[PDB]
């Protein structure tokens, strides 16, 4: 029942006179905001992305980030000049808060350098993590001398994050509780092992994320079933495949069973070798170029 809100910033510094900063904001697995380097304005990716905040409340918050983006860029490159008078440099920020029932939350601000987590804002200051390069000590000391920033970050983590997200959760309640029915189909590919076959159960178009997919022989769940990774669709729905390795001839009798919250107890059951399966397969026949390698 918990929802994680995250602002993700990626900054690139190729040399002394080149930089770009791009950001995305996610509430759970729904994108709420976008902030391209090209744009002077933070953009909404939802009609409810403002939350419960007023226009004047939003402008003051955006202005703060606008001052931040310019300042961050200049601060990094001035710190580069301190340490290596190396390049290129990649910096990532993960800022936000996780929500818990009821009215309680924990905030975070993580910073990575070259793809390794090195610094976090903790309490009232910046802190290096355990196992971090010792050259960071000086930049940290330099940055911790800024009381104005410390206060502003504290306000954003302790107060502003939870206040905004609660507003987002009420504003976007309808989209978060939205139900989308999955569709499934069957295919098969050669296994890497000689004489074997890999049956694929494609499950696509479902929302929300949680799903159950298993290959069955009647009442028996096949313990060889392998869930793949969740893969996104462009319309914010999800794709997943469940594979099963079988010896040639043991395909018959098998079924792919899918359980989802949008189905309401009425599971999708696709049987291998059924009339339905034969019809779908002949609608997707092709020349098999340039199929994925098999060895």
């Amino acid at each position: 029942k918990n929802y994680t809100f995250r602002c993700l910033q990626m900054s690139s510094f190729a040399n002394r006179s080149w930089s770009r900063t791009d950001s995305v904001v996610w509430l759970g697995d729904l994108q709420t905001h976008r902030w391209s380097n090209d744009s002077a304005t933070i953009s909404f990716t939802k009609p409810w992305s403002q939350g419960k905040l007023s226009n004047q409340q939003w402008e003051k918050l955006q202005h703060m980030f606008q001052v931040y983006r310019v300042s961050f860029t200049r601060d990094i490159q001035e710190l580069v000049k301190m340490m290596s008078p190396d390049y290129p440099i990649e910096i990532q920020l993960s800022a936000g808060c996780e929500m818990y029932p009821g009215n309680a939350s924990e905030s975070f601000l993580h910073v990575a350098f070259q793809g390794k987590y090195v610094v976090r804002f903790w309490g009232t200051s910046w802190q290096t993590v355990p196992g971090a390069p010792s050259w960071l000590d000086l930049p940290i000391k330099v940055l911790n001398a800024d009381q104005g920033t410390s206060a502003t970050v504290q306000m954003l983590l302790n107060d502003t994050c939870p206040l905004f997200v609660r507003g987002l959760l009420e504003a976007g309640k309808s989209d978060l509780e939205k139900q989308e029915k999955p569709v499934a189909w069957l295919s098969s590919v050669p296994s890497s092992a000689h004489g074997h076959r890999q049956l694929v159960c494609h499950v696509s178009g479902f929302y929300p994320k949680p799903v159950w997919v298993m290959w069955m022989r009647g009442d028996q769940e096949q313990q060889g079933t392998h869930r793949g990774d969740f893969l996104p669709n462009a319309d914010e729905t999800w794709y997943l495949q469940a594979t099963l390795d079988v010896e040639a001839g043991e395909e018959a009798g098998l079924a792919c069973r899918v359980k989802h919250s949008s189905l309401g107890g009425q599971d999708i059951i696709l049987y291998w070798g059924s009339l339905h399966h034969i019809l779908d397969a002949q609608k997707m026949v092709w020349n098999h170029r340039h199929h994925h390698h098999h060895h």
């Epitope: 001052v67 310019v70 300042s71 200049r74 601060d75 001035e78 710190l79 000049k81 301190m82 008078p85 330099v142 940055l143 001398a145 800024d146 009381q147 104005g148 920033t149």
Partner: T-cell receptor, first 113, second 107 residues
Framework: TQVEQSPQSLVVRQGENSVLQCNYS??????LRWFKQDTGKGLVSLTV?????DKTSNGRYSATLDKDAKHSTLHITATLLDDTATYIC?????????????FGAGTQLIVIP | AVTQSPRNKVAVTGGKVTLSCNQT?????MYWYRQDTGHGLRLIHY???????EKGDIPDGYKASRPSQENFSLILELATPSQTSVYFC???????FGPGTRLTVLE
């Protein structure tokens, strides 16, 4: 120029009060500092203004800062002869070592006996 | 306290000029400004410590050198008449300004 001072120069009678203005467009505006420069000498700090609405006082000198207006005022109460100097308005854009100071041309104060 | 030498210098066009700046404040950051009527101090070169030297807003015609924490130098390889000004040096951990150097470059 991102830091403008008015007037260019000011003539005041000894013992009266003199008012000096500062207007800036520096972003961000961390702090504002007033300096006094005697002829043929260096810059010597008079006072620092840090807060959004700030007021400061040091003997005859008293200053105010309004960050929403990006405006500052330096008051010299009961001006003396040795107060004849250039007064310079300085805005710093960081509260750290990575800051850059922005300077105004200065107001020349002439105290006539 | 911040010291500068020389305090006054008369130079020729195409000559070499080296302005010195010493501070015992033990500051890391050091700055070099010049002052001209109707402007306000403008940054020539600055340093973040021993070995560091960075371009300011107006670095053209000027070089800088930081051999140690205490010393920061402004070097004019081929002096020009436009480089006639009053030069101020500064140091910071708030900046502390030196007494200034009057330089006249003549034809």
């Amino acid at each position: 120029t991102q830091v403008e001072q008015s007037p260019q120069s000011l003539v005041v009678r000894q013992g009266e009060n003199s008012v000096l203005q500062c207007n800036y467009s520096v972003t961000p505006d961390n702090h504002l500092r007033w300096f006094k420069q005697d002829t043929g000498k260096g810059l010597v700090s008079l006072t620092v203004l840090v807060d959004q609405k700030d007021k400061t006082s040091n003997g005859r000198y008293s200053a105010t800062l309004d960050k929403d207006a990006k405006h500052s005022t330096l008051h010299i109460t009961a001006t003396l002869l040795d107060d004849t100097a250039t007064y310079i308005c300085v805005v710093g854009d960081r509260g750290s070592a990575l800051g850059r100071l922005h300077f105004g041309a200065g107001t020349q104060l002439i105290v006539i006996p | 306290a911040v010291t500068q030498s020389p305090r006054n210098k008369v130079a020729v066009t195409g000559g070499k000029v080296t302005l010195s700046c010493n501070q015992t404040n033990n500051h890391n950051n050091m700055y070099w400004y010049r002052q001209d009527t109707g402007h306000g101090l403008r940054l020539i070169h600055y340093s973040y410590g021993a070995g560091s030297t960075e371009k300011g807003d107006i670095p053209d015609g000027y070089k800088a050198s930081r051999p140690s924490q205490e010393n920061f130098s402004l070097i004019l390889e081929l002096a020009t008449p436009s480089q006639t000004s009053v030069y101020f040096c500064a140091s910071g951990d708030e900046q502390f300004f030196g007494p200034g150097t009057r330089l006249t470059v003549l034809e």
